[PDB]
Amino acid sequence: GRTYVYDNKYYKNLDAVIPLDNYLVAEDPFLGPGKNQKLTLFKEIRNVKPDTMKLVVGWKGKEFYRETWTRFMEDSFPIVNDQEVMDVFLVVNMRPTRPNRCYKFLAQHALYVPHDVIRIVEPSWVGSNNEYRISLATNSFEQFIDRVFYKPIVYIGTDSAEEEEILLEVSLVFKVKEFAPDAPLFTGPAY
Amino acid sequence: GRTYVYDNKYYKNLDAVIPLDNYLVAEDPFLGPGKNQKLTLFKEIRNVKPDTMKLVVGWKGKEFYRETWTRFMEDSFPIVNDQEVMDVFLVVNMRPTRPNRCYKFLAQHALYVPHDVIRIVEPSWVGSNNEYRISLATNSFEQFIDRVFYKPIVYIGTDSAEEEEILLEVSLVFKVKEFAPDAPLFTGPAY
Amino acid sequence: GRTYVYDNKYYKNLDAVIPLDNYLVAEDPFLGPGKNQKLTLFKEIRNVKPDTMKLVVGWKGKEFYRETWTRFMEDSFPIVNDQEVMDVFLVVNMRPTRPNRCYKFLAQHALYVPHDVIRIVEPSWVGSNNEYRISLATNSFEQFIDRVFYKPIVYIGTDSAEEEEILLEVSLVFKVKEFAPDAPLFTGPAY
Amino acid sequence: GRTYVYDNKYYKNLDAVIPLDNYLVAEDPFLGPGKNQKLTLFKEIRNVKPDTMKLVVGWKGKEFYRETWTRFMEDSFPIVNDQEVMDVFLVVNMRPTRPNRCYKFLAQHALYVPHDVIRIVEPSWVGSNNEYRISLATNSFEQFIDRVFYKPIVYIGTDSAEEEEILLEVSLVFKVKEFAPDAPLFTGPAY
Amino acid sequence: GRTYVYDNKYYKNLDAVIPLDNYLVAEDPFLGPGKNQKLTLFKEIRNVKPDTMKLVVGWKGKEFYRETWTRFMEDSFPIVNDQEVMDVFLVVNMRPTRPNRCYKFLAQHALYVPHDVIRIVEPSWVGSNNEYRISLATNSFEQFIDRVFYKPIVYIGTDSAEEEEILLEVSLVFKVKEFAPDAPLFTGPAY
Amino acid sequence: GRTYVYDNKYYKNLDAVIPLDNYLVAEDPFLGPGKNQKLTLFKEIRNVKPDTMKLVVGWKGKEFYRETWTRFMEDSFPIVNDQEVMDVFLVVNMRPTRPNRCYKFLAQHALYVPHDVIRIVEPSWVGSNNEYRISLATNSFEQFIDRVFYKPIVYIGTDSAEEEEILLEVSLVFKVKEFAPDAPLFTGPAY
Amino acid sequence: GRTYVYDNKYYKNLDAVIPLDNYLVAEDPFLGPGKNQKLTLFKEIRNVKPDTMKLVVGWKGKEFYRETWTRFMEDSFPIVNDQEVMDVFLVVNMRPTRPNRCYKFLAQHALYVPHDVIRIVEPSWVGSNNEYRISLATNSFEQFIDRVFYKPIVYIGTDSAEEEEILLEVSLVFKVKEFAPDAPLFTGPAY
Amino acid sequence: GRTYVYDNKYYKNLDAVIPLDNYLVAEDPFLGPGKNQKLTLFKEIRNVKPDTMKLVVGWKGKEFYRETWTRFMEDSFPIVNDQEVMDVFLVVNMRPTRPNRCYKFLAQHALYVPHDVIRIVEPSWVGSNNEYRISLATNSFEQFIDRVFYKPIVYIGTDSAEEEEILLEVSLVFKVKEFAPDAPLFTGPAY
Amino acid sequence: GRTYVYDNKYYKNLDAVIPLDNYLVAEDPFLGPGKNQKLTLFKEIRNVKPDTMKLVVGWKGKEFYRETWTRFMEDSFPIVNDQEVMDVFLVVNMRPTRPNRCYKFLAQHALYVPHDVIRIVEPSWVGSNNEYRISLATNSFEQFIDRVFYKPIVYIGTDSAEEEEILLEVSLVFKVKEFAPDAPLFTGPAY
Amino acid sequence: GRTYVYDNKYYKNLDAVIPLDNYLVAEDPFLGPGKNQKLTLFKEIRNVKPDTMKLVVGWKGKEFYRETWTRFMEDSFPIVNDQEVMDVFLVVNMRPTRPNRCYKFLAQHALYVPHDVIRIVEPSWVGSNNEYRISLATNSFEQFIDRVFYKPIVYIGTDSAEEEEILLEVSLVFKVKEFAPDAPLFTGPAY
C-alpha cells in the first residue's frame, strides 16, 4: 500500500487495489498450557508373537512411587518457585529393532502379579508417532509416603503376522504450572 | 507396475508411469478399545404430551444394584480371565410405535420419589440413532453389597406438537478390558 | 411441486423436476443442555506489564463460599422446583480500557497468600470472545458450611510489548437442570 | 447422529457434526398414472430402400375395430371393476434383422388405399428405444359397432444409404384407470 | 487410431491411447415433422398507446375463409400428391418502425364487432423472435363452403411507457404431411 | 474463539479451530481527498440529429467568470477558514426526455463564435453515469478580474440512428481542501 | 430416446433432450496379439544380503536348450496347426517368504562360470507385480540342435537394509501366433 | 506491450500488465525424420466370414522382390542424390464396400503355401485410420538379386457377427533419407 | 527436451511431449526509469489528538530552498555527467513510537503562517508502507537564487480514537536521469 | 498420529483424523540401468548457412575404431570386474557461440567421402537439451581388429534464417553393466 500525489491528483499501487460453533475440542496436553518435563525411566527390548502382547512394566506400588519420587526430585531440585503438577503421563515410546518392517503397534494398560503374555482383545491402536501416553492423575521419599496418581501396567503388541522385536522407552512426562513471581534473584545480602 | 527388457532397453507400463494438530477428539467408546456387552433390562411403552417428558425408570438403589449384579453375573458366569469393567453405560433406545411420524427425541437424566411427568426445559437433543447413552462410572449380591457407579433416572420427550406413543428399550452396555493369558485350555489332568 | 391434469395427460413444474465416524466432540456447556445463570460478582481494573500476569482474585475459602452462597441464593430465592447444579463456571471477561490496541489476552488459574504478580510461563491463550471460563465442579450460609466445588485464583496477562490497562469482569455461571413437574400453580385453596 | 453423556458433559459424533418455475413438462404416459396393458397384434419383416418408407399396416376400419375389440376383450375378460380407457397407443417397435448396422429409424403416420411405398419427406425421427408410439384417443363386437379412437396407418424408413431389412412389432398399449372398491371377494353365499 | 508393427512388437499413437426420464417435452412445430408453407397475407402499421392493445385483424368468417382458401390454393396448385394439413398457424410478426427503442411486445387473441382498442390485462409476453404464433386447428371456394380451423382476432401492444409505431406482418403457416409415392414422373404416353 | 478449562484440560470451539506492484492508478477525484461542492448553473433541452453534436454552452469569458464567481461566492459566503480550490470540474449530466430509448451519449469539449452543430468525429464515449466531467484547472467580481482555470465549450451527441431529445444539466463541481484550525467558535467577547 | 405423437404434436423424453499425435507407445506383449503360454521351470529360495544380488540360474547352454525344448514340446504336443513363436520371455516372479516386510525388488540379467553373489550397481528396479520379464528372441532335441534365442543369467536383490529371504519362480512365457485354418476336424474316413 | 511518456511519467497498457522425465516415446515414422514415398501395388475386394481372416497377398519371394524393385525404380528413376532407405512399410488400407456398417478391422501378418482362410486367434486390432502398417527392414532386377527386408503375408478380418465385403489397398511406404549436396544444377558445359 | 535415435527410430522424453487493451496505468516513479536519490532532512516526534492533524514542516521558502540546495549539492558533488532532475518528491515516512497499536495514518499537504493543528476534513488515507510521497515539480546557493519546484507544507493525523505519538522522517527523493558518455576515466595526462 | 488415554477414554489428534494399462514406455538409457561413461572426443566450431547442414565428423572406419578403442581403454584401464557394454551412444552436444540468438537445432546421421554440406530435407528436430544421441550397437587395438557397433557420420543445422556459428562437442557415452563380486580387495599375500 503506497500513495503518491501529483498536483492534487492521488495515486495508489495497482497490486494493493486488487453449526460447528456448538462444539469443543480438547487441546493436546504436551502442546497446551504448562511446562513439559520428560523423565526417561528405562529402555527395554521385547519380542512379541502375533496376536499376543507382552508386559512392559510390573513394578510394585512402592517401587513405582520410589522411582517416580527419586527421578522427579533428583532432576528438579531446587524447586525455586511455587508450582503445580497438573498431570503425570506414563509415556511408552516404541520402535522396531529391524528395518524394512511394516506393521502397526497395539497397546493396552490397567491402573496380584499380572500375566507377562496376554492375547490381543480389542486393543488401542497406536498412531504413527509410536507413542502410548497414559494420564496418571516433599523432602524425602519417607515424607512422600507419610503425606500419602495411579500405578500403571502396560502391554504392547503388533498387528504383525510374524514375531517382532521391539525397542521400548518408558518415560514419565510431567505437566508443570510454574508460578514464578515478578522478583529478581539478588546475591546476598540484598540491597 | 510391470517391467520388460528388450535387448538392454527397459520398459514400464504407461498407467504406472502416470493448525488442527494442536487439538484432540475422543474416540466413540462402543467403537474404541475394550469389548462391548449389552444386557437389555426391559421394554416400555410411554405416551408423551407435547412440551413434557415422562420418567423411564424409577428404581430404588437396591433394585438398580440387584438388577445390574444379577443380569451381569447370569450373563457372564464363568468369568474365566482377569477383566476390568472400564465403564457401564445406561442406554435408552427409542422408537415411534406408529409409522409416518416426523419428530426428534428429547432426553434428560439425573444421577425422594422423582416426578413422573416434567416440562421440557433446555433438554439434550437425541440424534438420529435414537439412543441416549449415559456413562455410570463378586460371588453373591450380598458380597457385592458388603464390598460396597451411579443410579440413573431418565426422562424422554419429543419436540412434537402432538401426543406421541414411544417404545423404549433400556439396556446396560458394559465396556470390558479382558486380560486373557497366552495359555491354552487343557482337559484335566494337564500333560 | 405442482400437478396439473389436461384430458388424462399429467404435468409437473419444470423447476421441481430439476472415518470421522469413530470420534466424538464435546458440546459447548453454555449452548448445551441445562439453563444458564450468570451472577456477576465484581469489576476490576488492572495494569499489566509485558511478560507478567496480575492476580485477579485472592479471596479466602470462607469469603469465596460466602460470596457464592449469598449471590446465588439472593438471585434464585424462591427455588420452586427440584433442580441440580450441573456445574459452576468462574468466568473472567477482559477488555482493553483504551481503543486502537492490538494484542491477545493470556490467562492461568489454580484450584498461603498467592503472588500478586508472576511472569508469563506457558500460559493459556484467551480466544477472541476475551473470556476465560473455569469449571469449578441450603437455608443459611451456616447450614451450607454445616453440610460441607473448588476455590479459584486467576492471573491475567497480555502478549503485548507495552504496559496495558485491562477492565476485568468476574462472574459465576451456573449450569442448572430444572425438574419442573407438569403441574400448574393454583391460588390457595386449590380446587 | 449419536449422543453420549459423561458427568453432565454432552458428546456428539464428529461425522454428524460435519425462472424455470413458470413452466410445465408432461409426464411420460407409460410411466404416469393408470395401468399399462400391451396387446401385441402382429410381427412383420419389411425391406426398405434408401430415401423411402414402407406401409406397416393397411387395415380397413372394420378390421382395425374387429382386431382391437377381439384382442382387448379376449385378454381382459372378465372386467371385474369399473374402469376407464384413458388412451390407446399404437406402438410400432423396430429392430434390424442384421447385426453390425448403424442407422436411425424414421417414421410417419396418418389418422382410398394408401401407397405401399412413399419417399421420405420431413419425417419424425425415431429415438434409441426404436419405438414410435401413436395416441389414438361391450359384450359383442356387434354391440361395439351399434354403440359407435382413430384408425392409424404407419410408414417406417431409415436414414441409411443402403437397403435395410427391418423386423416390426405392432402393438396396442392401453392406459387403464381401474376403480377397484375397498371390498373383498367372497365365496357364495356371502356371510 | 493408427497401428504399427516392428518385429512382432505392436504400437499405437499416444493421442488415441489418452429422474428427468419420467417427463416429455413437445417438439417445435416449425422444426418438427412435416413441411412448412408460409403464406403472407398482409402488412400493417399500428401506433399503440401505453397500457393499450390494438386490433390487428377484424375479418368476418367468410372473408377469413375466402382469403385462406384463395391464397393456399393459388400458391399450392397443382396439389400433385396425397397430403394432410396437420395444422394452420396464424403468425403475427412485429417490428419497431424506429431504431434505438427498447421494449417488449405484448399479445392476446380470441378464436359482434371486436373493440379496436383494449387495455392490457394479463397478456401473453412475446419472445425475442417478435412473433406470436396461433394454432388454428377443394376445387372452388364454393365447394370449400359446401363441404364445411378457427377464425382468429389478435391484439398487439408493448410494455413501453410511450406511444410506439409498430410494423406488423400477418401470415398463415401451414404444416403439411406429404405422401409422395415412390413413383417417377413420365412424359405421356408412359412406357 | 472461546476457551474452557475442565480439571487442567483446555478446550477451544471447533468452528474457530477450522508484477502488478510496479504500477499506479489514479483515485476518482469526487471520491478522493478534499470536499465536493456542486453548483448547478442551468438546465437545457437539446434535440440532436444522428451523426451530429450540439453546442451546450457558448458563454464569453467574462460571462463564464461572472457566473462562476457569483455562484461560488453566493453559495460559500462566509468563507470561515483557509481553503484551497484543488480543481473545478465542468460537469454535464445528460438524460433522455423519453422512456424506452436505448443509445449511448457522445461528447467533446474545447478549452470566434463556435459552431452550434458539428458532425461526430472520433468523440469521447460517455459512460453509464451519463456524465461528462471536465477538469478546468475575492471580495467582488471586479477584484477577481483585477487579480486575474479555462473557459469550456461542450458538444453532446448520441450514437442513435434517429433524432433524440436530451435534457442537459450543467454544473461546476469544486474540489476544496479546507484547513479548519483546532479552535472553537466563541460568542464575543471570548473568555 | 423415446418418441410420442399426440394429434400431430411430437414429444421426446426430457433426459434424452439434455501434439501427442506425433508419438507412439508399444503394446504390452502379454496383453497384445498372439497367445500366451507359460511353462514354469522351477521354484527357488534365496537369502539376499543388503547391497548384494544372488544368481538365480546358472545353466550351461545345452541344459537351457534341453530344458526349453523338453518343457515346450511335452506341453504343446501335438502341434496341430502352423504356428510362429513370436518371442520367448524369461519370467522371474519374486515374493517375500515373510509377512510384514516392506522393500522393493532389484534385478539385472546378462545374455566362464558367473559369480553367485555380486554387489548392486545401477540395477533395474522391479515394479509392484514383482516380475522381471526378459525377451530372449522339431521332433527330437537332437534335431533341434542339428537345425541350430539367447541363454539368460539373472541376479535378484532388494533395496532392503537387512537380509531378506525371497521365493523365486522362474518361467518361460511363449508368445504364439497360431494359424488355424477354417477347416473342421472329422473322424476318419472323412466324408 | 506499449509504452507512453508524459512529462517524465511512464505508462504501460493495462492488458499487458495483467517423474514422467525418466521415460521415452517413439516418434510416428510417417511424421518423423526422412521423406515418405507411397507406392500403391494393388486393390482387392475380400468377403470375410465372422470369426475368420482371409489372406490378402500370397506372392512368392521372387514376385515380391520383382514387384518391389520394379515399382520403386520405375517411380524413383533418376536417383539424383545419395540416399538411404531407412525402412519399407507394407501398408494395408481397409474400407467397407457398404455404408451404414459398424465394426472394427482385425489383422495379423507373418514374415509352403499359406492358408487362404484362418480363424481369428488373438489378433491385432486395427485402429480408426483402418490401416495396418508393417515394418519390413541397383541398375536391373538381376543386379538386385546378384547383390542379395522380409516378404510379408497378411490376413484381414472383422469383429462383425455377419459376413463383410472389404475393399483393400496394399502399398509399400518407403522412408527415405536424402543427402542432397549444397550444389546447384547447371546446364552443360558448367561455367 | 531430449532426443534419442535407435536404428532409424526416433525417441523423445515423455515429460516434454506432455477490452483492457484500451487503457493505461502509470509506472511507480521509484521503480520506473531514472535513478533514486534519498536525502533525509530531519526526524520529528508529534503527538496527535483524535480528529486532528499536526503541521510537520513550516519552513519559509528561503529555508526550504537553502536546505534543498545545500543537502543535494553536499551529497552529489562532483556532478560528473550531464543529468536531469526529472522530479523531487517530499517523502514523509511515519511510524508509531509504541507497539501494539492499530490505526491508519492520515495526511494532507499544500503547495501567512500555517495553523499548527487542524481538524481532519476529507484527508488522504496513507497506505501500509506508511509513506506520503508528494511530487514537487548551480555553484552556490546565491547563483541558485539568481537563476530563480513548489514549497510544501504537510499535516499528519490518524483515524485513532485516542492520542497517538508518531515518529516522522522527512526526506527529499530525487528522480535523476544520468547521461554518462561511453568514455572512460583516465589519469592525466591522457594517452 | 498421536494417542492419549484419560481414565479409559481414548483420544487422537484432530489433524490425523482429517485403458493406459495395455501400453509401455521405454526408460531413458542414461537414467536407466547400467553405469554411464562419457568419453569426450573433440570440440568443433561450424558456421551453418540457412537451409543447409554441415558434416560434423568424417573419420574412416579404422580411425573411428582407433579413437574409440584408445579413448575407452586409456580411461577404463584396469578393467577390474566382468562387465558388459550394453550400448555406445554417439553424443553431439550443440551451443551457439553468440548470445541473444533464438533458433532450434536440426540434425541427421547415417551409419565414399560424404558431402561436407547438404540441404535440410525432413530432418530430426533437436530438443532443448541441444543434444543428438545416436545408439551405435581387448589388450591392444591389433587384437581388437583381429577379433573383429556402427561408424557414424552426423550433419547439424538450424531452422534459422541467417548464418549461425555453432560450437559442437562430440562424445561417446558408454552404457556399462558391471558385475562386481561380493569379494573384498586384500593386500597380497591374502590371509
CB-based touch G/J (3+ pairs, under 8 A)? yes
Distance of alpha carbon F79 from alpha carbon F139, whole angstroms: 11
CB within 8 Å: I100 and C101: yes
Q: Minimal CA–CA distance to C127: which of A24, J13, A28?
A: A24
Q: Are B29 and D4 in contact (CB under 8 A)?
A: yes
Chains contacting G (3+ CB pairs below 8 angstroms): A, B, D, E, H, I, J
Using a CB–CB cutoff of 8 Å, tell me whether C26 touches chain J.
no
Domain ranges of chain J: 1-191
Task: Give the DSSP H or E segment for H63.
Answer: helix H61-76
Whether chain C lies against chain H with 3 or more Cβ pairs closer than 8 A is: no
Residue J39 has a CB neighbour count (10 Å cut-off) of 18
Residues 119-158 of F with CB under 8 A from E: 158
ω into H96 cis (within 30 of 0)? no
Residue holding cell 440532436? Answer: F48
Cis peptide before H189 (omega within 30 of 0): yes
Contact E136, E152 (CB under 8 A): yes
Q: How far is CA F140 from the centre of its chain?
A: 25
Going across the sheet that includes E35-48, the strands are E35-48, E164-179, E82-96, E131-135
F contacts of E164 (beta carbons < 8 Å): 100
- Among H165, H91, H153, smallest CA distance to H118 is for H153
Question: Of all residues in chain I, what percent are helix, strand and coil, respectively (each to 5)?
Answer: 15, 45, 40
Chains G and F touch (3+ CB pairs under 8 A): no
What Å resolution does this PDB entry report? 2.3
Collect contacts of J75-80 with beta carbons under 8 A, ≥24 apart. Answer: J75/J37, J75/J39, J76/J37, J80/J180
Strand order in the sheet with D131-135: C3-6, C9-13, D24-27, E23-26, G9-13, G3-6, D131-135, D82-96, D164-179, D35-48
**Interface contact B18, partner G, CB < 8 A:** no
Task: Report yes or no on chains D and I touching (3+ CB pairs under 8 A).
Answer: no
> Under a CB-based contact definition with an 8 Å cutoff, are residues C12 and C3 in contact?
yes
DSSP-assigned letters across all residues of chain G = --EEEETTEEEEEHHHH--GGGEEEEEPTTTSSSEEEEEEEEEEEEEE-TTEEEES----HHHHHHHHHHHHHHHH-S--SEEEEEEEEEEEEEEESSSSB---EEEEEE--PPPSEEE--S-EEP-TT-EEEEE----SHHHHHHT-----EEEEEES-SS-EEEEEEEEEEEEEEEE-BS----PSSP-
Closest chain D residue to A24, measured at CA = D11
Closest-CA distance of chain I to residue G26, Å: 12
Q: Is D98 helix (H, G, I), strand (E, B) or coil?
A: coil
Q: Among candidates A121, A138, A127, A124, which has minimal Cα distance to A85?
A: A138
Question: In 10 A of CB G141, how many CB atoms?
Answer: 15
The rounded distance, in Å, linking the Cα atoms of A11 and F32 is: 10
- Interface check for G2 against chain D (CB to CB < 8 A): the answer is yes
Across the interface, of F25, F33, F84, the residue whose CB is closest to I124 is F33
**Grid coordinates of I157:** 493525523
Residues of D in contact with A22 (CB under 8 A): 17
Q: Tell me whether H180 touches chain B (CB under 8 Å).
A: no
Cα distance between residue D17 and residue C28, in whole Å: 13
Our measurement of the distance from residue B72's CA atom to the centroid of its chain's CA atoms, rounded to an integer in Å, reads: 14
Q: Dump the DSSP string for F99-120.
A: SSB---EEEEEE--PPPSEEE-
User: How far, in whole angstroms, is CA I104 from its chain's centroid?
Assistant: 20
Q: For residues G21 and G6, what is the distance between their CA atoms, to the nearest angstrom?
A: 50
In this complex, do G26 and E10 lie within 8 Å of one another by their Cβ atoms?
A: yes
d(CA G119, CA B166): 76
Separation in Å, CA C69 to CA C39, C58, C64, C145, D131 = 11, 17, 9, 10, 86
Is residue E148 packed enough to be buried (19+ CB in 10 Å), middle (13-18) or exposed (0-12)? Answer: exposed
For Cα atoms F6, F8, F11, give the angle at the middle one, nearest 5 degrees: 55
* Distance in angstroms (rounded) separating the CA atoms of residues G30 and D178: 62
Find chain H residues with C-beta within 8 A of J119's C-beta.
180-182
Maximal C-alpha separation, chain I = 93
Q: Does B181 touch chain A (CB under 8 A)?
A: yes
> What is the rounded CA–CA span in Å between residue I58 and residue G55?
94
Q: What is the DSSP annotation of E42-108?
A: EEEEEEE-TTEEEES----HHHHHHHHHHHHHHHH-S--SEEEEEEEEEEEEEEESSSSB---EEEE
Question: Quick one: three-class SS letters along chain B?
Answer: CCEEEECCEEEEEHHHHCCHHHEEEEECCCCCCCEEEEEEEEEEEEEECCCEEEECCCCCHHHHHHHHHHHHHHHHCCCCCEEEEEEEEEEEEEEECCCCCCCCEEEEEECCCCCCEEECCCCEECCCCCEEEEECCCCCHHHHHHCCCCCCEEEEEECCCCCEEEEEEEEEEEEEEEECECCCCCCCCCC
Distance CA H167, CA H93 (A): 8
Instruction: Answer whether A4 sits within 8 Å of I127, measured CB to CB.
Output: no
Q: Which string of b and e fits H87-109 if b means at least 16 CB within 10 Å?
A: bbbbbbbbebeeebbebebbbbb
In the block, residue with C-alpha cell 462391548: B36
CA distance B152 to B107: 13
Residues of G in contact with A103 (CB under 8 A): 100
d(CA G29, CA G26): 9
> Where do the H-state alpha helices sit in chain J?
14-17, 61-76, 141-146
Cβ-proximal residues to D122 (8 Å cutoff; 6+ apart), any chain: E33, E34, E35, E178
Q: Chain D contact for B36, CB < 8 A?
A: no
H149: closest CA among H45, H83, H67? H67
Other CB atoms within 10 Å distance of the CB of residue A174:
22
**DSSP sequence for A61-114:** HHHHHHHHHHHHHHHH-S--SEEEEEEEEEEEEEEESSSSB---EEEEEE--PP
What CA dihedral angle connects A43, A48, A52 and A56, to 10 degrees?
-10
Of A109, A131, A134, the CB nearest to J2: A131
On chain D, the residues whose CB falls within 8 A of the CB of A23 are: 12, 17
- Out of D25, D109, D127, name the one closest to residue G1 (CB): D127
Find the radius of gyration of the CA atoms of chain G.
26
Contact E179 D27 (CB under 8 A): no
DSSP F3-51: EEEETTEEEEEHHHH--GGGEEEEPPTTTSSSEEEEEEEEEEEEEE-TT
Which residue type occupies E160?
Answer: S
Name which of G2, G14, G15 to mutate to probe chain D: the one with the most chain D Cβ atoms within 10 A of its Cβ: G2
**C24, C34, C178 ranked by CB distance to B25: nearest:** C24
Neighbours of A170 (CB within 10 A): 17
User: Are A166 and A48 a contacting pair, CB within 8 Å?
Assistant: yes
Which has the closest alpha carbon to C145: C59, C60, C62, C58? C62
DSSP character at residue C44: E
Q: Give the residue from C20, C21, C24 with the most B CB atoms within 10 Å of its CB, the best one to mutate.
A: C24
Cβ E183 vs Cβ D119: under 8 Å: no
Cβ of H104 under 8 Å from any chain D Cβ? no
Distance CA G54, CA G117 (A): 5
Q: Are B57 and B170 in contact (CB under 8 A)?
A: yes
Question: What are the chain A neighbours of D12 within 8 Å (beta carbons)?
Answer: 23
- On whether the CB atoms of residues I115 and I53 are closer than 8 A, the answer is no
Q: How far apart are CA B73 and CA I21, in angstroms?
A: 87
Q: Are F132 and F91 in contact (CB under 8 A)?
A: yes
F30 to chain I, closest Cα gap in Å: 11
Q: Are A136 and A152 contacting, i.e. CB atoms less than 8 angstroms apart?
A: yes
**Residue C114 contacts F where some CB pair is shorter than 8 Å:** no
CA dist., res. D57 & res. D150, Å (int): 14
Distance CA F183, CA F188 (A): 14
Closest-CA residue of C relative to A176 is C122
Angle, CA I151 vertex, CA I146 and CA I155 arms, to 5°: 165
J132–I12 CB contact, under 8 Å: no
Report chain G residues whose CB lies below 8 A from the CB of A161: 99-100
Q: What residue of G is the nearest CA neighbor of J35?
A: G122
Q: Does D18 touch chain A (CB under 8 A)?
A: yes
Which residue out of H20, H88, H94, H132 would a mutagenesis test of the E interface target, given it has the greatest number of E Cβ atoms within 10 Å? H132
Rounded CA-CA distance B154/B134 in Å is 9
- Output the 3-class SS for I3-63: EEEECCEEEEEHHHHCCHHHCEEEECCCCCCCEEEEEEEEEEEEEECCCEEEECCCCCHHH
**Measured in Å, how far apart are chain C's first and last C-alpha atoms?**
53
Number of Cβ within a 10 Å radius of residue E36: 14
Q: H101: which DSSP letter?
A: B
Question: What are the Cα distances from residue E42, in Å, to E91, E133, G57?
Answer: 11, 16, 99
Neighbours of chain J (3+ CB pairs under 8 A): A, B, C, E, G, H, I
**Are F13 and A32 within 8 A, CB to CB?**
no
CA I34 to chain centroid, in Å, comes to: 12
Compute the distance between CA of residue B119 and CA of residue C178 in angstroms, rounded to an integer: 9
Full strand arrangement of the beta sheet holding C124-125: C117-119, C52-55, C153-158, C105-110, C124-125
